[PDB]
């Protein structure tokens, strides 16, 4: 997250880290057994780490559970990142408590101008690399479809939205993929892609979770 602040240990209880020997993507817990993340985060042998703040220190509230099944969306296109969403089933159910909790799925799409919370352990520099130990947070607005389409000519589908700042300086960045964009207490977006991070006129692009809620619910109840 570039231009963010420190969330505070376990203040974002639905945030998870996907780990293959190191942290490489985030995700969000949507119930005791299922995590949603980005389809480009697919890897065999994912370990899901819940209850994390400092990803390098054991602080006592972590639960590490292997992924038993990852279900990439049927129409995911790895070239355009359209339908960039994946569900991960945990090998055993997480113990929900005050530090580990799920986030609600939306009943409606959020409108442009709604302020949302984006979080992750990704790069905090727009130029250079500084990867944080603790979870970072950013409040950012959903931008209009016109601005989004204007910023990325021909690359935005109906399954994507832009959130951030056209002035640059604040954005999600590498290592934040798959993590949450929460608006009004509902999961509205998944960190997906952008042209670098926090660049002028190149806001981050996010998977539009409200287009997938019936697919998510059907998949969770059937696997």
């Amino acid at each position: 997250i570039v231009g963010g602040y420190t969330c505070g240990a376990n203040t974002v209880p639905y945030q998870v880290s996907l780990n293959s020997g190191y942290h490489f993507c985030g995700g969000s817990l949507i119930n005791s057994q299922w995590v949603v993340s980005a389809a480009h985060c697919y890897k065999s042998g994912i370990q899901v780490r819940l209850g994390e703040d400092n990803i390098n220190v054991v602080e006592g509230n972590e639960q590490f559970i292997s992924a038993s099944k990852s279900i990439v969306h049927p129409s995911y296109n790895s070239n355009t990142l359209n339908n960039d969403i994946m569900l991960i089933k945990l090998k055993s159910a997480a113990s929900l408590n005050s530090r580990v909790a799920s986030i609600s799925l939306p009943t409606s799409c959020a409108s442009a101008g709604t302020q949302c919370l984006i979080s992750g352990w990704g790069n905090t520099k727009s130029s250079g690399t500084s990867y944080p130990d603790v979870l970072k947070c950013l409040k950012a607005p959903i931008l209009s479809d016109s601005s989004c389409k204007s910023a990325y000519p021909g690359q935005i589908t109906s399954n994507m939205f832009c959130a951030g700042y056209l002035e640059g300086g604040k954005d999600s960045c590498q290592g934040d993929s798959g993590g949450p964009v929460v608006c009004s207490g509902k999961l509205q977006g998944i960190v997906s892609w952008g042209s670098g991070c926090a660049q002028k006129n190149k806001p981050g692009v996010y998977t539009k979770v409200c287009n997938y809620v019936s697919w998510i619910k059907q998949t969770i109840a059937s696997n």
């Binding site: 892609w193 952008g194 042209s195």
Partner: peptide, 29 residues
């Protein structure tokens, strides 16, 4: 550029996904 925000090590630009490139400190961006 279309560059997904996954953390990925690299030694050359061709190691990265889509239009991400390999930065000086060994990670795609």
């Amino acid at each position: 550029r279309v560059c997904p925000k996954i953390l990925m090590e690299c030694k050359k630009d061709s190691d990265c996904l889509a239009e991400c490139i390999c930065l000086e400190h060994g990670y795609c961006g």
